Write a protein that binds this ligand. Structure first.
Ligand SMILES: [K+]
Ligand SMILES: [K+]
Ligand code: NA
Ligand code: NA
Lengths: 159, 162
């Protein structure tokens, strides 16, 4: 539209469960708002065990039932450069925040926030890691509402 | 129980290494001494960030420690490094952010020995020790760190069989 494309990076630990789910859901929400030419999403993980792999089967199953594509999505590890490239860096939990701030040397981190920061009220602050819980349904609900509220916040602030 | 064999080492980690981890270091050391474990367990602290390197603990923590009649002679802030991960048997973080920072630092190194202090208080929740550098509340940090160190020491005594 007017000016540069907005970019959003979702960050979790493995970049196989949470952040890919968020990337795909957010992308789908944006597409439906007709914003695909104005906002772009990616994800990445703090850790590197899963680099190059498709999302966890649990996340694939969730997305499939939502009818959301995830073709071509494959884990990658966040880098320092990502901090400069992306307008919004959206962590899943407090551990991820700690990782990102330390990577940034505790400088220029105002754009690094948790997904549930965008959900007013909200009992939870963290999206739990289902690699450990097994609870992909809970994650899906938390990520859906978080993405809806994040998109609205970006839509407001940037247009 | 146990100086019988190699010394067990515990590193307490917070953000600045001036408020929480020094308080935990001093308190935990005091608890270990009371149990007669000075010859078996050694504690240290360190911070994620580097703003306060070389400084003594925050005045609030000094005041708490004075009240508890616990010494902190020679305790001076330092920043945690990769080598600390391999050196210490236990790495005990004050909050989830601290854990995440240590994870970013670890690379391919094992991180299974990195836990939060209040993970050992089974089960309170509170899970995080609040940062009094920001909150201004040294009293609640003292209470949390006392109970956490008590449970931590008991867990180590059970695990290492003293
Ligand atoms: K990715
Ligand atoms: K220290
Ligand atoms: Na940026
Ligand atoms: Na070790």
């Amino acid at each position: 539209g007017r000016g540069s494309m907005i970019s959003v990076l979702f960050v979790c630990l493995g970049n196989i469960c949470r952040s890919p789910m968020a990337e795909a859901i957010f992308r789908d929400l944006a597409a439906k708002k007709g914003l695909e030419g104005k906002i772009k999403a990616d994800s990445a993980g703090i850790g590197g065990w899963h680099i190059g792999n498709p999302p966890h089967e649990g996340t694939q199953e969730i997305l499939r039932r939502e009818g959301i594509s995830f073709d071509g999505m494959l884990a990658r590890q966040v880098s320092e450069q990502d901090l400069d490239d992306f307008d919004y860096i959206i962590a899943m939990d407090a551990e991820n925040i700690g990782s990102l701030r330390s990577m940034a040397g505790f400088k220029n981190t105002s754009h690094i926030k948790r997904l549930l920061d965008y959900v007013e009220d909200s009992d939870l602050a963290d999206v739990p890691d289902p690699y450990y819980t097994g609870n992909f349904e809970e994650v899906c609900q938390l990520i859906k509402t978080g993405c809806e509220q994040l998109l609205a916040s970006i839509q407001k602030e940037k247009q």
